[PDB]
Amino acid sequence: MDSAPFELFFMINTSILLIFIFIVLLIHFEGWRI
Amino acid sequence: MDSAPFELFFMINTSILLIFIFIVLLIHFEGWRI
């Protein structure tokens, strides 16, 4: 229990990333590879 | 180093979830909250 506040660091970053990652990935596959 | 393979469990689940979560959230806000 020494990485409680530290763990969140990954929960936030991974979020802001996964979001723009997936959201963007959608379009790229939705027909953006012309 | 006793939670190496276990950690991945969260890296996968959180993914399949965050994906459908964000992707779906987009539409819901893109004009699906009538």
- Nearest by Cα to B22 from A8, A32, A24, A13: A24
Whether A13 contacts chain B with CB within 8 A: no
In this complex, do A23 and B18 lie within 8 Å of one another by their Cβ atoms?
Answer: no
In this structure, the number of other CB atoms found within 10 A of the CB of residue B28 comes to 10
Which residues in chain B are contacts of A10 at CB distance < 8 A?
none
Q: Whole-angstrom Cα distance, residue B20 to residue B14?
A: 10
- Residues 6+ away with beta carbon under 8 Å from A27: none
Structure solved via: NMR
- Residues 6+ away with beta carbon under 8 Å from B18: A15, A18, A19, A22
- Residues 6+ away with beta carbon under 8 Å from B26: A23
3-class SS of residue A1:
coil
Q: Whole-angstrom Cα distance, residue A16 to residue A10?
A: 10
